[PDB]
């Protein structure tokens, strides 16, 4: 699909770096519910707080 | 004059501290995440 800022290529031929990779925004809440459950079980909320 | 001043005072205080409580409720969970049950 047309994009004015991105281009598709092969990973092995490009040898891209982290900043060469393109960025997008992903919706958290579906993941955040499961994360809340897992962290409430495992007993490490500081990490959840930072990530949230 | 008595009920007048009393009710005026009560209304003014109610409005002022309603605004202040709204602001504090907005800015609570950020500065105190250990209480937010969203993260618990």
UniProtKB/TrEMBL annotation, chain A:
Protein name stated in the entry: Uncharacterized protein
Organism: Toxoplasma gondii (strain ATCC 50853 / GT1)
Organism lineage: Eukaryota, Sar, Alveolata, Apicomplexa, Conoidasida
Covered range of the whole protein: 105 to 156 of 571
Highest taxon in the source lineage: Eukaryota
From TrEMBL, chain B:
Top-level taxon of the source organism: Eukaryota
Protein name, UniProt field: Uncharacterized protein
């Amino acid at each position: 699909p047309w994009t004015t800022d991105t281009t598709f290529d092969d990973i092995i031929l490009s040898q891209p770096s982290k900043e060469d990779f393109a960025k997008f925004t992903k919706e958290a809440p579906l993941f955040l519910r499961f994360l809340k459950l897992v962290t409430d079980v495992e007993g490490r909320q500081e990490a959840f707080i930072q990530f949230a | 004059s008595v009920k007048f001043m009393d009710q005026k005072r009560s209304g003014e205080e109610t409005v002022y501290f309603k605004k202040e409580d709204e602001a504090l409720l907005r800015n609570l969970l950020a500065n105190h995440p250990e209480y937010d049950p969203k993260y618990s």
